[model samples]
Target: YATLLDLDPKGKRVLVRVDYNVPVQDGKVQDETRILESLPTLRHLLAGGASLVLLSHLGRPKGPDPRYSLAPVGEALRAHLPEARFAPFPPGSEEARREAEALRPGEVLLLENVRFEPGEEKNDPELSARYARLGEAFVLDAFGSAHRAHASVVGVARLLPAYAGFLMEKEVRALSRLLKDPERPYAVVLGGAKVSDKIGVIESLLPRIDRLLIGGAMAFTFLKALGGEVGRSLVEEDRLDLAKDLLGRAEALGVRVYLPEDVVAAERIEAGVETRVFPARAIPVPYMGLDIGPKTREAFARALEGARTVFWNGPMGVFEVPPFDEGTLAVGQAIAALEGAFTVVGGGDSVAAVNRLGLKERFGHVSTGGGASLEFLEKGTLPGLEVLEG
Candidate 1:
């Protein structure tokens, strides 16, 4: 892929697509991780004497919703890059164009939420052209949105000299390593609410992974598929056959598939609720399996023992609730203790587990985009990323 080094940005206005889709509350940017991650690319462009026109989408909005505005996020950016100034105008605005045009080298103009434009998500050609008018070169720093072939992501790249930003390059390198030459025994830990959402990545990796540890509420579906009694636990009744097929495929591939032997059953999903550990095969009525039990955590750690490569996504349980969060934290800590193993943590919940546990530094790579990472690992390349190579 073409990277930042491949393009000469000196004295040119660079249109950089960044993933600033962070959480906001009331009128404040709650978390700045995504904002901070884009700093290296922004700084590099500025260092190369380039004026930057930064584009990003916040929360999904139907259209022109005031609540989804990027103004607060722009303010957060200004706190870091004082040269960054917000253009409150909507997409394709003449005022926005003037503001972008007025930016000198070392200055940055943050445009409004790209999704505010109806054509942005549609990848409308005219919308792409409108974005193209803002700059001469394009840098894709938004790995989170790379999977979406939208106007600001893929379309704009086609109309300009495109390059991968530092974050993009780093993400591609780390994730590609997992897909390519990961050392054995390659182990993967997966958890989440549903099996359907993970089907693609699971199918892609099952052929390569040595050990597959399954947790989260999704495990109930598998247990039920095995004809076990999972009382009131979250089970995808329709995916039972699919779950069995995956297990069969794993057996055919000679991969070791580990499901929870015991689980933390709870009467409700609230904190302070009394919980009990039960054999995963048989949770009594009126209780839901919310997390992997203590025994299961130890078993999972043992399954990960001596793994040369590890990729973990999702949480072992309901990570937002206390006690149920222990399983995820335990798995995170175990992965972190793998001193020499190439460990990568992806997905929102597992990434949050590592962050909350202060073990982010231990993982080989903590991905910024769970869905994008999964898609990249499944497909090897994304539309936005591939366009940059053109």
Candidate 2:
């Protein structure tokens, strides 16, 4: 993983795959967190004396759309790496090669939208070879894109002497600890809309986790399995049988699968809508369960007491709304209060919940890759990871 740092970077061109797929609004970067996450790897390569050839995909472009350009990000990157040169390559042009060639040691050049090329997402061998010619080695710093077998990610790694960048190494190492020997009693808080979305993760973690706290709309499917009336709460009619199978598996394995006993019901999902807390088994026909109720929050918090390890993914409710945010916030605060626990928050919504509570600093690691982290926990191998395996 430190191979990039160990190399003789003097006069060498290093092509780094970074996850700068940040949100943009009218050609301005809306969020720079992903860009900041890559700084350590970029800085390390530059400080080691390498000419940086940074490649990143911003947004899905039909082809060479100016709106999807990485140019705006260059301006943002310039602020972070002021000393490094900020060169934006024309979309899908050979100009990147020329500019990269002219780069002096320690200078950095950010490539335009890699996804602008049709073959990039396909892992086209020719495109990979072309990108490979621009650098002496490859460093994968894009943990967020690790799951995709794209040209700039897995393909370029195969074409060059590939190594995990700092961000990649950090994510892998931190996640590995939880899978291998996480401190017990380990608790996994799973949520989101559909049980289908987390079926793989739940199944993979069921045998390992001590307590599996379930919430969100997905809990309705499980509730339905137990013959509970979930009312208008979102339920996957197609996955009702699958939900029952999961419950059966959990019971057989002795895993305590905790579902919300009561919920915050709402006439609608709107912020100002009338909402009330009610027993999970008694949600009314016109009302939907939007969040876990106060009683459920207390029960969940009590269940988390003295937990040595915790992994949270997804939010307990529609946390974007006011009263519906209590369940997720309470759970997040409870995890934060746990001293000496290897607490980890994964997935975008879960991380946002933690941040909303101003408890971002409380977690041991807030994973940058949501889908990537979920896939990794399911024991699935990411193409970016496979490319670096010796």
Candidate 3:
């Protein structure tokens, strides 16, 4: 794919696809991480004498819903780029085109949510042509939506010259390094709810990684597959054979697979629930394993030690619940504490745990795109990204 350096943006109207799908509460932007992440590309284009027409989707809205409007994101952008204007016109409309054309080199215009249009998600050619007219070139910075073949993401790219933004480039480079030439003793910590969700990445990365630490509710499936009695735990009964196959395959590949030795068990998944520590292989009846226990945390941390490269995704437990979050926190801290190790964390839960620990900067890269990163690692390309290639 072409990069920002390949383009001469001087005096050109550059359309940028950015991920502004931030958490909004009470009509205000809650976190500005995604917004801040886009600054490098925006500033770079601005510095090159380019008038920017920013396109993004806020949230899933049925059609023309005011709640999903990009107004709040525009409000947040003003803090960094005060010259940024919020154009309420629907994307790909004549009104939006006029507004894009009206943007001066020093100004930036943020169009409304592209999903509001009926043709945006379907990648309608007509809408793509309309979006193509908004700028002379396209920049795909929205790695979060790169997997989706949407009008603003992939459609516009096909109709105009497209380049990868700084954020996209950084994400691709960081994830690609893990697949290509990772440092020795590479470790991957995977958690979350089900084995099915991570099967693709697990298959793709198992051959490359030296160690695999599995936790969260998903571990119950692996434990059950190993003839352990997981009581009321979230086990994917359908994936039992698949889990066993993965374990066997990892063994055949000489990769060490680690499952929780013990787990924090609870009768229900909520805060203030009475919790107990039990061997991960043998949870009592009516109790489900919610988190990796203290011993498991220590063991997982030990396995991560001396790893030269590490990648983490998902949470070790229902991190939103008190006490259940300790395992995820411990693993995150262990990875962050690694000296001279290239540590990268993807997925929202793990990223949130890192942020909550105030250790976001300690890791090598905290990916902004959760699903996009995993998809890229699994298949090595995305629809929005492929369209940007020469």
Q: Give the candidate number with the greatest lDDT.
A: 3
Please provide TM-scores, in order, for all candidate models, with all chains considered together: 0.97, 0.94, 0.97
Q: Tell me the tens digit of each residue's lDDT in model 2 across 1-390.
A: 445555666768988888888889988998888888889888877877788888888777888888988888998998999755555564245887888888888788888889888889999998888899889988888888999899999887887888888888888888888889788899999889888999988999999988999998899999988999989999998999999999998989888888999999988889878888889988989999999998989999999888899999888999888878888889899899999899989877778788878999999999987889989989756778988843
Residue-level error in angstroms, candidate 2, position 74: 1.3
- lDDT of each model, Cα atoms only? 0.91, 0.86, 0.92
lDDT tens string, model 3, 278-322?
A: 998889989999999999999999998899999898999999898
What is candidate 1's lDDT per residue for 190-307, written digit by digit as tens? 9999998888889999888899999999999999999999998999888999999999999999999999999998888999789999999999999999999989999999999999
Angstrom error at residue 69, model 2:
2.4
Error of 2 at 221 (Å): 1.2
Candidate ordering by lDDT (highest first): 3, 1, 2
Give the Å error, residue 172, model 3: 1.1
TM-score ranking, best first: 1, 3, 2
Higher-lDDT candidate among 2 and 3?
Answer: 3
